[PDB]
Structure formats: C-alpha cells, structure tokens
Amino acid sequence: GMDVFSEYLAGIADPFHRERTEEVLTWIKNKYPNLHTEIKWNQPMFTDHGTFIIGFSVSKKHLAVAPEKVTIAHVEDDIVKAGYDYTEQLIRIPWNGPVDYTLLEKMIEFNILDKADCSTFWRK
C-alpha cells in the first residue's frame, strides 16, 4: 500500500511536488487496487504478477513517468497532444502544468493487458 511510498514522499522537499506525487500514486493505488506497490532503485513503481507496470521519479522541473518503450509508442499521439516532452522510456509532466490522468489510464491499462503473459520484470 501507500506506506511503501512514505519515506520516498518525505524526501521530496518541495511541498507542492510532494503533494502531487502523493496524489498520483494514491490515485493509481485506489483505481488499480490489485497492482502491487514497490520501491525499486529508490523509485516508486507498480507491478502485476511480478512484472513492471508503471514507475515514477521526481526532478526539479517534472514528474517522470515510465511505462516502457512499447507503451510510449502505443500512446505517442496522445503524448504529443498533451505536449509532454518524452523519450523512448518516459514522459515528463511539468509541475507547472496538469497531470493527464486519461493518458496514465491508457498506459496502465495497456500494460496490464499486454503484459498478462509476461514472465520477466521488463519486456524482453
């Protein structure tokens, strides 16, 4: 549960950054209650049957969201429309603009379905 994330959240200095980050994680916890909460590489992530679903990290300018490369590709048009800067591995959600929860839903739900038979942590 969310207690897994408490120490990580406390270490976020900026209180608004901490608040939003907590909100996003809690939203996923409550909407996808079968996902497992884990801290790995000192980053909060959600897993399903031991496979990676979605992970997060914080920087001074953004919350970074990592759904794996194939999933960035899957929702690329939606990322461009939202305006987020992205790489092959992640999207950058600036603290001074909104969280696109629709986009997060699509990524999480795609990964749950698409990785149902995935036997490794990361896609191979």
UniProtKB/Swiss-Prot annotation:
GO biological process, one term: iron ion transport
Source taxon at top rank: Bacteria
InterPro entries: YdhG-like (IPR014922)
Recorded GO CC terms: cytoplasm
Matches recorded under Gene3D superfamilies: 3.90.1150.200
Observed phenotype of the null mutant: Reduced growth in rich medium, unable to grow in minimal medium. Reduced activity of Fe-S-dependent aconitase (citB). Reactive oxygen species are drastically reduced. No bacillibactin (BB), an endogenous siderophore, produced. 20% higher intracellular iron concentrations.
MF terms (GO), sorted A to Z: metal ion binding
Chief localization: cytoplasm
Cofactor mode of binding and number, as noted: Binds 1.0 Fe(2+) to 1.5 to 3.2 Fe(2+) per monomer.
SUPFAM superfamilies: YdhG-like (SSF159888)
Places the protein is found: Cytoplasm
Keywords: Cytoplasm, Ion transport, Iron, Iron transport, Metal-binding, Transport
A Pfam match: DUF1801
Record carries keyword Cytoplasm: yes
UniProt keyword annotation of Transcription present: no
Needed co-factor(s): Fe(2+)
Function: Plays an essential role in iron intracellular trafficking to iron cofactor biogenesis systems including iron-sulfur cluster (Fe-S) or heme assembly. Promotes the biosynthesis of iron-sulfur clusters by delivering Fe to the complex composed of the cysteine desulfurase SufS and the zinc-dependent sulfurtransferase SufU. Also plays a critical role in coproporphyrin-dependent heme b biogenesis and thus provides an essential function for the bacterial global metabolism.
Assembly behavior: Homodimer, upon Fe(2+) binding. Interacts with the SufS/SufU complex. Interacts with CpfC.
Name this protein carries in UniProt: Intracellular iron chaperone frataxin
